[PDB]
Amino acid sequence: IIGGTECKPHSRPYMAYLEIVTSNGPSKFCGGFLIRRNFVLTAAHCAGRSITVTLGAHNITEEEDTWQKLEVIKQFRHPKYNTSTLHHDIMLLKLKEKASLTLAVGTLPFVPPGRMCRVAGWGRTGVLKPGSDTLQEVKLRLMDPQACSHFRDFDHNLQLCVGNPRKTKSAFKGDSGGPLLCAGAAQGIVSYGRSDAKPPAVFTRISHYQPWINQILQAN
Ligand SMILES: *[C@@H]1O[C@H](CO)[C@@H](O)[C@H](O)[C@H]1NC(C)=O
Ligand SMILES: O=C1NCc2ccc(Cl)cc21
Ligand SMILES: [Zn+2]
Hints:
This protein has 2 domains: 1-12 and 108-207, Thrombin, subunit H (Beta Barrel); 13-107 and 208-220, Thrombin, subunit H (Beta Barrel), CATH 2.40.10. The chain has one helix at 206-219, and strands spanning 5-6, 15-22, 25-36, 39-42, 50-55, 68-77, 91-95, 116-121, 136-143, 159-162, 179-182, 185-192, 201-205. Strand 12 and strand 13 form a beta hairpin. The strands form 2 sheets. A 6-stranded antiparallel beta barrel has the order 8-9-10-13-12-11. A 6-stranded antiparallel beta barrel has the order 2-3-4-7-6-5. It is mainly beta. It contains 1 helix and 13 strands, in the order βββββββββββββα. It binds 2-acetamido-2-deoxy-beta-D-glucopyranose (NAG), 6-chloro-2,3-dihydro-1H-isoindol-1-one (1P7) and zinc ion. The site of 6-chloro-2,3-dihydro-1H-isoindol-1-one has 12 residues, from strand 12.
């Protein structure tokens, strides 16, 4: 998260920290959010050979009692996710068991441009900076679709355009999969943006994927 503030520990109890394993490289990391006690929503590009989810984290380098480290049994990447257009960047993760509900861990129960939304994550705090030890959050402005025209594959139906180009505030690498909340309700999922982090950026529009989401939650 670029240009954000460190959150008060555990004030975002639905936040999930994902460690993703691949066969041919070291671990990678993403965000995500708990929407059922055994389901986490994240971005499809965060898929890998296997994933571990940590709930209840603030400083991800110091283990504490709030932590619940949970195995992911199955990954449900959206079947139409496209590695060229980046369309349908959404994935459900089924946890091996249901998480415990604590003060630090809970689910996130399932807008005109100009609205302020917020997004949290452990991602990099600058284009050349490492991932953040702690959960940061930033408030970002919802933009008209034309603000994102330079992303040639952007689609107003499938995606949100987020971030005032006049501010340096933005999500960045490692924040992928985290929810964008507008009015305390998840509206988007961090997906992609420019490599130099100049806003706006592109978020998955959750509402478009709701039937698919409900589908997976009923068949599993
Ligand atoms: C996070 O925890 C690590 C290990 O305890 C510590 O070195 C680091 O300074 C902490 N960062 C913050 C912002 O508290
Ligand atoms: O939101 C973003 N703006 C730039 C950017 C880069 C990478 C990722 Cl995962 C997200 C963003
Ligand atoms: Zn704590």
